[PDB]
Design a protein around this ligand. Structure first.
Ligand SMILES: [Mg+2]
Ligand SMILES: [Mg+2]
Length: 185
RNA sequence: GUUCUUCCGAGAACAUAUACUAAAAUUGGAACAAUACAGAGAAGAUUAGCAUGGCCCCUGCGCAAGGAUGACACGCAAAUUCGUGAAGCGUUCCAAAUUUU
């Protein structure tokens, strides 16, 4: 967007590629419109709008029914789960969920819990620490790591830390990263 | 006033205090007749009665018997006095998802 404001037809460019279109950022929304305007005029320049989300081909219309290419490719399959009734206090549920997983799941792995913000990610750390201090020696060590966009560098760097070597009884120790949408994308 | 005295115009005896004192003038207290109008004790109703009480009477010779069982009684039915533990308070809140030039 900064280049176009000096050179409206993007004169240096032959093939554009507007990646990650799903994120729909103010930079991107402006671009797309001007770039469709460019697709008039500079009638030699290719445009390849990529999106990583499956989105309902609204992009396909917008650009004069341009051809849509679908490419699959995840790495592993994921299991999805729901609560059958609707819990009325989600943080009490989330905290309770973390403990439940820590105790019952036999597979090694870390827990990534999505909360709304620092008023909660700093509460959820504390309260989850309380119940693991209650569960004592049998349960594996759970390490609770907050993660939000304004943590200083040293506090962010924790997330790279590996789990304990687990307790001797075979109880799986785990890292629990509690994070806003910074862990989403 | 009437009977006696006489020197004669006075004397003596008898007789002794009635009457809400009115032909009045004033000033009160009871019961009558009845216009339009409704219903007179007893835990639904139809209804004998006998009591109880007292600054309420009437008829009755009356300690008999009657008057709506004479009437009234008919609710705010409030009268010697407390003992317990919680909670506001003594004046006082509420908070940053991601991120780009
Ligand atoms: Mg009766
Ligand atoms: Mg009678």
């Amino acid at each position: 967007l900064r280049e176009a404001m000096n050179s409206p037809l993007l004169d240096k460019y032959k093939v554009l590629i507007l990646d990650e279109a799903h994120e729909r950022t103010l930079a991107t929304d402006i671009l797309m419109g001007l770039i469709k305007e460019i697709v008039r005029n500079r009638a030699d320049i290719k445009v390849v709008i990529m999106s990583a989300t499956l989105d309902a081909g609204k992009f396909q219309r917008y650009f004069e029914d341009c051809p849509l290419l679908s490419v699959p490719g995840r790495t592993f399959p994921v299991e999805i789960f729901f609560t059958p009734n609707a819990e009325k206090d989600y943080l009490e549920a989330a905290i309770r969920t973390v403990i439940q997983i820590h105790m019952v799941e036999e597979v090694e792995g870390d827990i990534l819990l999505f909360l709304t913000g620092q008023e909660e990610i700093e509460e959820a750390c504390k309260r989850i620490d309380r119940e693991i201090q209650a569960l004592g020696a049998d349960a594996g060590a759970l390490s609770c790591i907050p993660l939000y966009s304004t943590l200083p560098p040293a506090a962010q760097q924790r997330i790279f830390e590996p789990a304990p070597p687990n307790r001797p009884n075979g109880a799986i120790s785990r890292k629990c990263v509690i994070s806003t949408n910074i862990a989403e994308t």
